[PDB]
Symmetry: none
Subunit: 239 residues, 6 copies
């Protein structure tokens, strides 16, 4: 067994809390084990066909050692930009921006604690926030079509650690992985993206297929967790 | 007769203090003043630029009623951010013996998850508890030059004149109509630390100041008790 | 009994106010608090971004005893700068009826030519005189909805506990020793705008606060007089 | 052949590799994928910014006039675009996968990829060209006797864009094809039959796993041509005067 | 003889290649010996804040210098040298163009140094003019010109200074660093001056020296103007509108 | 005819006020007509052979219409950097940095009011400040050479306005000059730089002769003004 007592194919405990804050149309605190990310979906009137932007960031204290605030430093880190763009791509893949009307949805993912898999947790939670924002826009009757979402989005890290394929890697496993990867998938039997291979690793087709098989199994578990959380009543006051 | 949320003029919104909200920081405190939520962390490092303490305040884009642009993306800190950041630094350093801490550095981070008025005062109140936990952590690791670095407790609350009445801890609703606004920082040893941030366009008589101070200082006593209650619990994590 | 510059605890440094120091701005005021020299200007423009006023404070690199780095060259505004800039803007707006001004904008610039303590209080005191000249200018150009946009006068002074004594208008040396010190922003009507904390962070008794306010408000009276004397002269324009 | 430039779906644009385009850097390669043009240089430095292993960094930029309509300089805006940082990081990650930094010794190689003309596939061209520049930088260091081992390079790196355009799977997409593709991505591979990365590009889309397999098939088939083009160019004499 | 193999009045081999890239209306790779600069002219309709306008920007690729230099976009700011040279280029090119005759169109000039071995800004100006000409040719063929001949003269520039007690033109990096005094001279094919600038660090000069420097510089520009005409005599290498 | 009643070859009234502020070693308020520039020279304990650096900036209200503060914009204008570099290069031409101590002299030129010829005023004033800074340093025994200054620096603007050559152009003339430039010279019969200004224009060789003749005549007057002001005692003293 792993360090956290998990089996190789097991996700960490996933906790999805809708309406963690009240101002955003969507506000979801998602936890993959000790990894905690607050994902919000803010709605505005007027695009700059609707639009969806995505921004990812980590609180200075989220990491084991405190990192400098990017605002203080005066610039975004490369990693930040990389992840933000991944999230933006991932979410747009399952939303019909024409059915959204000329609206703008700003996705914000702020990591409160980082113990590996922060970008995949962020994507998984961001989708729930997006669902709530859409529910909100629907109530306020601002959607060109009642169902802009064509599929659900989830994501999970996967890699070879200690000679074995494992899913949802915490910090310690990730730093030890001979090959690692982030998989974004839909509940409608399709892929959205495979992202961010670990530094210095090259993989064979067979290895890719096995990594995908693992990740897709785990994603199914994520879709269910999302469905369970979304089955509850909207945590706020509908327009 | 009563405020929009049913409160009396002297009553604080419900106060919730959760220590060990995250594991990595030596101190991690989620504090809530009603709907206002601020994550307050205290990170510990060795060396300095006596020890030092620095503080940074920030608001998540979605914390406000309408999303605000991320400062890192905009490429600069807003004036509000530097004002409040410096306030927190001054306030906290007021009750620490940096000479009795070692050549260590405590970085205070206050990140607003939801803004509903009084974020900077909640931030200060929560930051003190985080600091206290950072001091406990340092103590266990045998890093202190003196066993008791903290010389007093810090707390803070907003006060103002809304509807011609002197009220404490203003939400956004009240704070937007306040005839006069401000933030008071005080110690649990009867002393003051700072009075700050008068509402836009607001002026106030000397006599009004004294009533505002009376009220604020009353609420702070409630805050110090809440802090003590929270700090009574065991350290919420693994200790060196 | 006597301070380094031969002053009593309650005495202000010699105050000099020179209007029309430059000709381009509607208001151009060189104010001096002893050795502290601040050029305060008021620029008038078309419309807002009810009129609006903004304020910006900055120190010339050579103003400080040891040359400080130019902010433009550094690539960022210091926190102290934004903090003071905001205070100046708010203070002035507290004694203007923007409606009486009509859609219009007054840009306040306070640039320190020489810093010897109390640069921000000098900047506020001088800025008001520049603002008055800006109003005078706008009136002559017949761009004012109301002839009397100014509802009161604004001045400010530093005060603190130095060498165990309550003292007003602290120079650089006294400021660095100050056990406690602050900037009091007052109106000539009899109200307060702000009491800005400044140090690294300190605690003071409420009775001490009352003393500090008492002396500070007295010194401001002297400042309001200096403002009137200067403003009693003819507009150094450049009349429209 | 229903492609704007006359190509079949599986065909690469004409590839031109010119080594020693400039003479100051240890490696300097102008690479062309049809009308796309990228200058890929490799500058060598003594030491590293601590264990005993060298380092390789990568930066990618587009000249203002490279795009169809002039774009503003990032230096003038005072900010790096997310696109720039994204590509810069991928290039460095891709090249490091085939270089033994220990066997390299404590030397640092700086890869710079500047787009002179942009007509799609600029980051895949950048990667493909950067490897040749890297190889030349290694030849330089080898001759100067600054290597802990004579052969730090364990494989060759190339990349090509692939996607679904006009309902067909196509490789090496120009500007116009890329801007209308249902699905598109950049495949980075080695010449040892392994994958380095599959970089998603564009607005965002979903694709069946069977489609991915087809995309990889054609992309990897195109990379073989790229690997041969790199070989043929490197078979020429070193354009500079090895120490 | 110089370490170059050149005489004191000799320019390094000059190469001008029009249509190096296809996207810009004008695109010229110019080489003063080992110095290589890509000079582009991008046509835009309309005007900034405004007669038409011309802007100029100069930059060096990190590897252009002997030791790789930091990318300005990564630094987070332009260097003073960059803005100094960018402005010099803008003034120089606008001096020989009638922006009225150009209509309300904007020409953006970009000079990116691929390899630096002295005289990069002068090479940039010389190559930029050729690109400007091609841009004017483009606009004409499109018809978006108020007057068929907005160019009133040809612009060229060269470096010159006193090295080892002798006056020389087109200084490489080598001589550039040993120069008692050196500067950049921009001139027209009419024989008039456009600008003299960038005196070497810590150097002063008598008017008699300045006159010697200018005479030398003007001679060299004659050669440059010939090179420009030769290159511009070839057909437009792009695909006219 | 010229607006202010000046002939073509004469300067606006020049006023030089040393010790305008006390903190810096050299502090000079110089005025060319209505142009006012505060030129200071600050000393330091080292360098980056001594060193001299210069910075020029304009107060927002210095111009007819307020200009944006550069620190607020977040970047230096090209004009600012162009002039800063010119000023530092000019002053360095007449000082033996080796003769100077192992110290730096930071030159700051801040324009209080701009009515044309700010940069030539800045240079002309900056030298006087530099002089006082040298006086200060030698009086502190922190100089290696009793006389680091090998010459005096002064500058004036010259151009063609209304078809005729004129010296020291105010704003109204500068904004309509066909040809325009700034001449930096020494008091020892040499030149330092001829900085082109304006939008850009050509001028004949013989025109350059006329421009320099008139400009160099004006500079002599400036050299006089500098001498007279430096003839007065140093305000402050240092044993």
């Amino acid at each position: 067994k792993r360090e956290d007592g998990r089996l190789d194919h097991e996700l960490r405990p996933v906790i999805i809390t809708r309406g963690f804050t009240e101002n955003p149309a969507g506000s979801v605190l998602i936890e993959f084990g000790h990894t905690k990310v607050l994902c919000t979906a803010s709605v505005t009137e007027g695009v700059p066909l609707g639009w969806l932007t995505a921004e990812y960031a980590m609180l200075p204290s989220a990491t084991h050692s405190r990192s400098d605030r990017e605002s203080v430093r005066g610039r975004l880190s490369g990693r930040t930009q990389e992840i933000s763009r991944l999230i933006g791509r991932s979410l747009r893949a399952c939303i019909d921006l024409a059915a959204l009307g000329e609206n703008t949805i700003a996705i914000d993912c702020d990591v409160l604690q980082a113990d590996g898999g922060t970008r995949t947790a962020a994507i998984t939670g961001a989708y729930v926030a997006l669902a709530d924002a859409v529910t909100y826009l629907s109530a306020a009757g601002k959607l060109s079509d009642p169902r802009p979402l064509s599929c659900a989005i989830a994501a999970v890290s996967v890699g070879v650690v200690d000679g074995r394929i494992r899913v949802d890697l915490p910090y310690e496993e990730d730093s030890r992985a001979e090959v690692d990867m982030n998989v974004v998938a839909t509940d409608t039997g399709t892929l959205v993206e495979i992202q961010g291979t670990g530094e210095g690793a090259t993989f064979a087709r067979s290895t890719l297929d096995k990594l995908l098989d693992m990740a897709l199994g785990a994603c199914d578990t994520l879709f269910a967790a999302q469905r369970d959380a979304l089955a509850l009543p909207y945590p706020g006051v509908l327009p």
